[model samples]
Target: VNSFSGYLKLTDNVYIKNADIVEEAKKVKPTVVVNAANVYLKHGGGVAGALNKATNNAMQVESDDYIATNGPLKVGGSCVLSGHNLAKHCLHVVGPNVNKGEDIQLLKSAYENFNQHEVLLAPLLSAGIFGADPIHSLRVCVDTVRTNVYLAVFDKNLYDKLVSSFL
Candidate 1:
């Protein structure tokens, strides 16, 4: 809800102003500023399960019924688990919104910017515009934008391997 560009710090007395959500996260002070985006308002979908209707919200990978987050979070691809055996996080996510044929172009742009160019996408919490709840927003984002959707589609064995690895 505020705008500025800098490192956001979570201090006792901070006054945020005139910046987008993600911008504020960077400029204002906070321990962790989690975000979700691509929530295009009133659409069937925006990105990932930008419109999850269930409690689990994320899409099922089906290869082994493993869950996956969308484009804005970490996904367990074969390349990701080369060294680490399990995903080290508080949550596990998966979804149908990534390769479901709606937001591929947008997701691609976001990936190229973040993964290739190192520019974190701004406008974080705007995911509300796409109907994502707090959890759905973040979870779906991570699943939708990962490079592993292809693996899940063409290589069930790979997806199965990842499921076993993460499990």
Candidate 2:
């Protein structure tokens, strides 16, 4: 809404902002910051690694504890937790990998779980080392998110093309 900062609407409910998502999380201060984590709920590399470091490495410890209590998260499943320095809770959603074509439904289910309340700041899910197609990732986000949200496009090259093509 008017309280947040960003331009270029990806959908009626999702706004695409170009910035380092980790730093952006500090500024937006959303209630739920989405983490593109693995099925095992561990964040050591890639996008999740940035947030793990940002939360002063507490995120990894808490995530592992959650996994110990509830078991490993599946491809389509997500788990919520507190203790994030910025957001009230963190949504650790495990997106599907690009192993095959059947992965779309798994990815869709991940986005479905992202429908939590309040302002949510999420990355371009599964678009990094997961090997998911960037266009497919955007489409999945556009189709699933119903609440007003911030979609951080960390790469300016992709951000520029999105704006040029759609805006």
Candidate 3:
């Protein structure tokens, strides 16, 4: 469903909603859609790839240009670029590779590092191929985000897990 399936209110102004990221981006047209990017900022796969396709590769071109000008993004860092077809901007963030034992702080930094926006559409970073545990990723997401956020769930298992854990 494009609408939120469930949510947790963390404060008067902040809440995290469980929903489909791609679909919700279309509906809400948030100020920015957070990209789960690689250090290279290549929009080759996962949510990054999806957004690239949705934007007719305009997102990719801009992302590549950003990399060309500034070099590779560091893990836990981000840069803002035109969101093109999806939102007003894309907050491209490099999520940490969780193979290292102490990557939890870096993963949290991925979420904590974004700039101000009224609404943010974000995927659960580092939880897929990057290898962070889904439960831990969701907890980090909920704990670190202080803005109104939509945490897009792609996998059925992740949806179920988040439902059980937070809903």
Candidate 4:
């Protein structure tokens, strides 16, 4: 761990870092950067949008044909691809749909497909546009993903709160 980065360890394996997701991706240089994408592989909104823009929409373009046949991707299902700007692989999963009570289980399932890697960078999944509770989503992510997960964020106050809440 980079001690100077002030990353808060929320679990034995999960860490929350107050950093831009893309920048953090560069720092960690993870094997894969997880994308909370919709079933259509539309990378035009939220974290997906930002990541799409970052990778020049390669993920969306590449995954489009797959989604055309296999979508709408359910919450737990995932599509893995390559060509991300920072990471070699990108794991795309549709977050829990709006107001779905089983979203946590779905979130758990979304992460289940990936075998263990050295590290993975993900946003607060399903929280922004999907309207899932951030705390609950974080909990599900931490509990479900066994890798050394880095939850990236930009806000200092929210980051502090998240670190403290887990403590």
Better of 2 and 4 by lDDT: 2
Give the top-scoring candidate (lDDT).
2
Reference-based TM-score, model 3? 0.84
Candidate 2 global CA lDDT score: 0.79
Ranking by lDDT: 2, 3, 4, 1
Task: Give the distance in Å from residue 65's predicted Cα in candidate 3 to where it truly belongs.
Answer: 1.1
Clashing pairs in 4: none
Summarize candidate 1's per-residue lDDT along 1-167 as a digit string, tens digits.
32223332222212112233322333333222212222221113332232122213322222113223323333221111110111111011121134333442243333232232112222222233333232332333344443211111112343234334331
| Residue 144 in candidate 2, Cα distance off native in Å | 1.7
What's the TM-score of every candidate structure?
0.23, 0.91, 0.84, 0.84
CA lDDT scores, all candidates in order: 0.25, 0.79, 0.75, 0.73
| Residue 135 miss distance in model 2 (angstroms) | 1.3
> Candidate 1 — which residues are off by over 4 angstroms?
1-113, 143-167
- Once superposed on the true structure, which residue ranges of model 3 sit more than 4 Å away at CA? 1-19, 99-102
Candidate 2, 63-149: lDDT as tens digits = 888888888888878888873885778888888877534376688888888776656888877787778877778787888878777
lDDT of 4 by residue, 1-167 (tens): 53225677778878788887777766666777888787777888778887778777676787887777776677667777783676878878777766545445676677665445567777877777777777787777776877777778766787777777873
